[PDB]
Design a protein around this ligand. Structure first.
Ligand code: HEM
Ligand code: HEM
Lengths: 87, 87
């Protein structure tokens, strides 16, 4: 139970510390704390997106990196949507 | 004295509550708590950037709003930089 969740922005922003770092990329939310020590660009760079939507930063440095496959085991879930999104 | 300070990432993240809400826009840090009740987009929207760098969110909704003049009385200071930034 509880493998994949809906993530509100309020929830996402709680996870803004190195040891508890969530980032949203294209609506998918990942727990990148276990990846911190491996990121080729270093920890400080990854932390620029801590607790936030990292899509723009990600796209400005390496748009084609296969994050979905690399981070699959760290997938938290998906960002919540406003009902109007579905109009 | 003490009107403008250097703001670290650690310090910025502490000011994440509605009554003590700091937002960084383009390196400038503002305590927006007094502005909460006036923001045309409402309080929830402004809270999306609480205790964080709000530049991307700000630019996604109203790039041209004159925040420097509007929020001048709320200016905390500037984000810290690493020495390497000055190379
Ligand atoms: C969202 C904030 C991120 C920032 C600011 C960032 C920044 C960087 C930077 C500066 C580099 C070195 C690029 C260069 O010197 O050309 C890099 C490399 C790399 N990063 Fe990130 N990164 C972010 C997120 C991620 C994430 C989430 C992943 C993994 C899913 C990732 C995987 C990689 C990979 C695979 C490389 C090496 C690409 C190559 O071999 O050329 N990055 N990153
Ligand atoms: C922190 C400094 C900010 C200032 C000084 C500011 C100022 C303003 C102003 C002047 C408007 C009305 C613009 C108009 O007349 O067309 C507005 C609306 C709005 N604001 Fe902000 N804002 C700030 C931050 C933010 C942030 C960070 C967000 C998003 C997280 C946001 C979300 C919105 C939204 C959604 C609207 C209504 C936009 C629309 O319906 O087109 N604001 N704000």
């Amino acid at each position: 139970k509880g493998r994949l969740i809906e993530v509100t922005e309020e929830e996402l922003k709680k996870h803004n510390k190195k040891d508890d770092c969530w980032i949203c990329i294209r609506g998918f939310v990942y727990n990148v704390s276990p990846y911190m020590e491996y990121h080729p660009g270093g920890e400080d760079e990854l932390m620029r997106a801590a607790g936030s939507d990292g899509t723009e930063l990600f796209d400005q440095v390496h748009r084609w990196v296969n994050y979905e496959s690399m981070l699959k085991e760290c997938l938290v879930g998906r960002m919540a949507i406003k009902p109007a999104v579905l109009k």
